Chains A and B, each alone.
With several copies, the nearest count.
Chain A
């Protein structure tokens, strides 16, 4: 599990955690339509798909500095609503599930040298 080896990886992971935590808070209030998925005209609101888009955009800026490359962005970042996963009996608007894929930025390591002398 190479990922959680260096302490650098751990500190950067904590940094991404606190950054995303202090970032998501602009989705408080908002109002998130989840049945008609059609925000009206003149009312501040967002749709789960729009939220996923926002999250992706965000995760596509801190890349290189906090994350590294996000191989398959279509799968590493997933946002599933409560109703989506749970067959609708036990569903309740407001609950969402976000899951990402942390990949510490690759660092330098050993550089094996094989200098082989000769004449002329």
Chain B
């Protein structure tokens, strides 16, 4: 309603990169109140001395917790399947990401996973 912050839609598409089979795009639901976090600029900076800075190349990062869908195996969330993700917030913004790769897999219990997606670039759609 032009104010309320939060996530509204989450779409995920799995492609297992051995058999080359695609699943989705399947929707998902947030497991708690926390929201996904982002980092779009693929150029991290490092503080030199006297006002300068070293500009190196890095990755577009994204941190996303979701409830595991009981028709997709857990391995596809643990990093054995390339993911294509899309998040849409209430305020109209959308963040799309293609050819993602789950890095640094974290131990999960089977119903709520936290994926650390790394991709070359994330796209916005700044609400009109």
Contacts and interface: CB of A to CB of B under 8 A. Distances in A.
Given a CB threshold of 8 Å, the question of whether A touches B is answered with: yes
Interface footprint category on A: 20 to 34
Interface in A33-49: 37-47, 49
Contacts of A41: 27-29, 67, 69
Interface of A is mostly: loop
A54 B69 contact: no
B9 A38 contact: yes
A43 B26 contact: yes
Interface stretch (A11-19, A56-64, A96-104): A56-64
A57 B94 CA distance: 11
A39 B26 CA distance: 9
Interface string B64-93: 000101010000000000000010100010
Nearest to B126: A74
A44 B9 contact: no
Contacts of B9: 37-39, 47, 50
Contacts of B110: none
A14 B29 CA distance: 30
Interface residues of B, number: 23
A53 interface: yes
Contacts of B96: 50, 53-54, 56-57
Nearest to B122: A57
A52 interface: yes
Q: Which 9 A-B pairs have the closest CB atoms?
A: A53-B96, A39-B27, A53-B94, A41-B29, A57-B96, A57-B123, A53-B125, A39-B9, A49-B94
Given A44-B26, A50-B9, A61-B98, 13 more contacts: A30-B25, A38-B8, A39-B11, A40-B27, A42-B27, A45-B27, A49-B92, A49-B94, A52-B125, A53-B86, A56-B123, A56-B125, A58-B98
Interface of A: 30, 37-47, 49-50, 52-54, 56-58, 60-61, 74
